[PDB]
Amino acid sequence: RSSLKEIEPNLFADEDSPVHGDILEFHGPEGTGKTEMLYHLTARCILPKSEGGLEVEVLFIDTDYHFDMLRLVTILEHRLSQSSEEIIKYCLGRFFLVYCSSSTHLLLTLYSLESMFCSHPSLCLLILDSLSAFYWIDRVNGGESVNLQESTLRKCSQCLEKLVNDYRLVLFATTQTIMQKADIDYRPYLCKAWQQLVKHRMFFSKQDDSQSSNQFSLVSRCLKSNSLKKHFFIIGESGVEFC
Amino acid sequence: MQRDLVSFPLSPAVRVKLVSAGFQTAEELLEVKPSELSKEVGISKAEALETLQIIRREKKCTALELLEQEHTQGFIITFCSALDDILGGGVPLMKTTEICGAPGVGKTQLCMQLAVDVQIPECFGGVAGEAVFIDTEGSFMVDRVVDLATACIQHLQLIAEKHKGEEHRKALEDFTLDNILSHIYYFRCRDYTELLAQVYLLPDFLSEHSKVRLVIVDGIAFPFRHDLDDLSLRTRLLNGLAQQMISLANNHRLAVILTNQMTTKIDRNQALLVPALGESWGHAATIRLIFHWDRKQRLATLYKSPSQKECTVLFQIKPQGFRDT
Amino acid sequence: RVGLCPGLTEEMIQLLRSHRIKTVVDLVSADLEEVAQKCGLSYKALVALRRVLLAQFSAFPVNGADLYEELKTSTAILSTGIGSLDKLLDAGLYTGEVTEIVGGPGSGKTQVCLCMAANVAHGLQQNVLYVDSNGGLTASRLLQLLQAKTQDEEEQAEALRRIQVVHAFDIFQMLDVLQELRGTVAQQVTGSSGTVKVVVVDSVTAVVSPLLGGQQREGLALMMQLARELKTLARDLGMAVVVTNHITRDRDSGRLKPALGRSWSFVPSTRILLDTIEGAGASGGRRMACLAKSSRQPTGFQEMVDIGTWG
Ligand SMILES: Nc1ncnc2c1ncn2[C@@H]1O[C@H](COP(=O)(O)OP(=O)(O)OP(=O)(O)O)[C@@H](O)[C@H]1O
Ligand SMILES: Nc1ncnc2c1ncn2[C@@H]1O[C@H](COP(=O)(O)OP(=O)(O)OP(=O)(O)O)[C@@H](O)[C@H]1O
Ligand SMILES: Nc1ncnc2c1ncn2[C@@H]1O[C@H](COP(=O)(O)OP(=O)(O)O)[C@@H](O)[C@H]1O
Ligand SMILES: [Mg+2]
Ligand SMILES: [Mg+2]
Ligand SMILES: [Mg+2]
């Protein structure tokens, strides 16, 4: 019922099999277009089929409290050929947002979301933002024992893998670059189960030069085939546009 | 409504024990017997009592009351009319003030003049308080203070004679040299550890002596600029000291005066004088003054202030002390 | 525990403690059939208990159109009292998000915060809470700013009475103040004349710098807790939170960047950078404004501000 190529032919030019459970990951520093990419994916997924959409529902989980409905509405109205309030209402009728305040809160939200997931059959995409939102607090609360710094993340990863395997969903996660290492910059620090659960990896970067910005770099790295690709794209009032 | 344990000042061991036990919110332990808490967690009963006391430890003032308090509290005059005019009336209370300058420019003279002036009776527009002087360089000479106090006494006597009142005479009855000298408290710190120890002991001393209105630390650059190669430790100590000093000034309604030194910044094959101790130290103080020579005159520049505007004035040092023109 | 939720008795709680079930997550992360064989409790009561516990202690999603309609009449835009900054910020700053102002000493962060507070207290007539951590707040400057907008003494006094001042000099005092404000606003839902709309933290760097350094990790946890408190205040209660930060230069690259580190770099939803205009042409008031980070505008646009003309 779900096809990965249709979601994004630009980035997913190799994956053509009907997706029946995948885990992806975004990574990079601040202000490099991760949330804009998520907005573009949601816009591609929730638009009507007449305007070039997918007509399936999206679930969103916000952890860093950085979601902006105004930007999403602006992108939707710019992508639409004709702007009308009722069509925007129809589009937004298939969008859901959840807030979590702590690791246990997120764990219980995951333990509760399966009721909706069995209730709603049209869900095809799942987004978790800022998976590394609670790292320092958990680490400090865990003392010097590593196993006490990893339990909540372990349980959340197990629940996420169970959900994605059971309900045939697509997961999009975001992490933050917090620590360096004594061309890809990546110093893994997450849970071992989460690290081994990843399938695709994408890194984000921004041009240092001030050519009015308008240039972002993305490096796609799939662990299945060890294929490294570089993408260039721009972000405008209508969303993101690939160079 | 929920308060997390991480926000409370607890030791890491007891906190991690509580976290591993299963306690996550502050209110969760407000209904647990200390004996049962010690039994389940495994801590001692003294630890349970201490943490229960600590957790139950964490008014309403508007800008109008703050303005009234600011108007009621006066300023400390420097006997330099231009400096007072550009400062807004004088050195303000509840604020941290910093003075920078090249050697032999007049920072210590200003410190002594402020220490003398903080005791002017309120009938003449003063504050009528006492001063605490902390010396880290050994440059405090009593004879200079005696000269300054005698000059101030003569000035006030002349003003009172010109006015020809009755309140002024009564106020000047007790404004003698002995009282002025006895209302200045002196400390000598020969190392930065000693300076930190004295600053730590300061709050109890101020609690005992509630009439103090000025705290002077003549020299913070010298203790921190020698035999200290770990600069991160220096920055941490300086930030802690600045926070402690501003807290003291706000809590005890004082005026804090700090004196800094000048260093040379070498760029584009040009040499400019800048305050020492780095860039992050510039945020520590509330008001920053810079003293320098132009040709032969001495200039005071209000480099930074959150209430006034940048300016520049002229002053000079006389046998009577800090003066103008 | 007794009193946490209905249907829980002390005997059942002790029996569950006998079989290594202590917290809510432990009870939820279990199995109905597997657990009901070591002690043999009620079969269909366990699922009801877990459903009740999930109902109380789990967040619930909302359909997009519903909160779209809700935020249509809830989000407000507050003018800063400066036209150039309003144009740069696209007519002001929105409630429900965190705004950060960065710059070196004398940049003008305190002046901007004071102008915002005066404009909100007088122009919109709403309550403002000011949190001061470095002694940079003065009532004389606020009175001077207000005198340029009105001449009625009673009006000025009424505007001044709407600004609350709080002093916090360490991290624990700031956290206590924020939690007390959260509790007060939660208790004050019914009232509408007196609720605080804008919160200003004069300097978050002044209370976090002493805790950073060495090989420890407590400072990072404390500053993340502070960020969580600020985010909760901004989003849950629909307020506007403005904080200030220091500026630092990278040693290996020579580029100006905000302080407090890469972990703090992710916190604000909007960032404004102030600067002096190359010394010459910026003898006073003339400051250089920029949009370092945003979520609705391209990054890099520059404007012009004058502190001297605000008074
Ligand atoms: N209307 C717009 N036109 C052009 N660029 C825009 C527009 N709106 C936002 N941007 C760009 O979006 C960028 C920030 O993107 P985004 O908010 O997705 O960051 P991010 O990489 O997810 O970072 P973080 O998670 O730390 O917030 C800015 O650099 C800005 O230039
Ligand atoms: N009434 C005024 N008229 C003109 N300029 C003023 C006035 N009050 C303050 N200023 C200006 O404000 C500047 C300092 O701004 P401000 O106090 O906001 O700095 P800041 O960025 O908060 O600094 P800090 O990091 O030291 O806390 C001074 O350089 C001065 O020129
Ligand atoms: N009794 C006095 N009469 C006149 N001038 C004096 C007297 N004592 C000191 N001075 C002048 O005042 C200045 C004092 O500077 P000082 O306080 O030492 O500054 P710093 O501490 O920054 O070196 C000296 O340059 C000196 O010429
Ligand atoms: Mg983002
Ligand atoms: Mg000296
Ligand atoms: Mg300031």
Side-chain angles (χ1 to χ4, degrees), chain B residues 282-283 285 303-310, chain C residues 104-111 134 141 144 246 287 307-308:
Chain B
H283 299 279
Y303 171 80
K304 196 192 65 164
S305 175
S307 166
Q308 310 280 327
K309 196 179 63 67
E310 294 202 36
Chain C
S107 303
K109 316 177 284 277
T110 310
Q111 302 301 314
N134 44 10
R141 185 78 181 122
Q144 200 166 304
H246 292 157
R287 301 276 183 265
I307 311 167

Side-chain angles (χ1 to χ4, degrees), chain B residues 2 28 31 61 63 95 243 306, chain C residues 1 111 135 137 163 165 169:
Chain B
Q2 286 183 332
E28 280 302 307
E31 57 199 277
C61 174
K95 308 292 195 197
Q243 276 314 96
Chain C
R1 201 203 44 242
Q111 302 301 314
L137 160 63
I163 302 180
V165 175
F169 300 115

Side-chain angles (χ1 to χ4, degrees), chain B residues 237-293:
Chain B
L237 293 158
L238 280 181
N239 289 341
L241 185 85
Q243 276 314 96
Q244 278 159 38
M245 296 302 290
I246 184 60
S247 179
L248 192 86
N250 187 252
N251 283 326
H252 285 93
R253 285 105 163 96
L254 307 154
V256 171
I257 294 276
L258 300 174
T259 78
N260 209 10
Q261 287 176 352
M262 293 277 259
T263 193
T264 293
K265 164 176 293 322
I266 302 165
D267 275 329
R268 73 275 189 192
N269 291 318
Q270 198 53 43
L272 273 297
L273 285 186
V274 289
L277 299 178
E279 292 268 359
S280 71
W281 183 246
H283 299 279
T286 311
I287 302 170
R288 185 171 251 194
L289 282 154
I290 294 190
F291 292 1
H292 53 270
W293 307 84

Side-chain angles (χ1 to χ4, degrees), chain B residues 70-98:
Chain B
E70 275 185 9
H71 271 104
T72 291
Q73 293 165 4
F75 304 89
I76 306 177
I77 57 167
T78 66
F79 276 166
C80 180
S81 304
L83 195 65
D84 303 1
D85 292 352
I86 70 163
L87 274 162
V91 166
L93 306 196
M94 303 170 71
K95 308 292 195 197
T96 297
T97 317
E98 199 183 60

Side-chain angles (χ1 to χ4, degrees), chain A residues 26-79:
Chain A
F26 291 178
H27 191 108
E30 61 93 7
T32 52
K34 311 183 264 305
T35 49
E36 297 284 354
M37 202 64 51
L38 287 185
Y39 289 150
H40 172 92
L41 271 295
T42 59
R44 175 66 184 274
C45 170
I46 72 176
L47 274 178
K49 65 195 77 58
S50 299
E51 280 275 308
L54 274 297
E55 281 273 326
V56 291
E57 301 181 24
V58 174
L59 199 148
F60 199 107
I61 298 176
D62 193 2
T63 319
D64 44 354
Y65 293 176
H66 268 175
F67 183 83
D68 212 358
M69 185 64 73
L70 264 69
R71 175 61 175 177
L72 181 62
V73 162
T74 291
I75 288 172
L76 279 189
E77 88 177 3
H78 275 80
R79 200 148 305 196

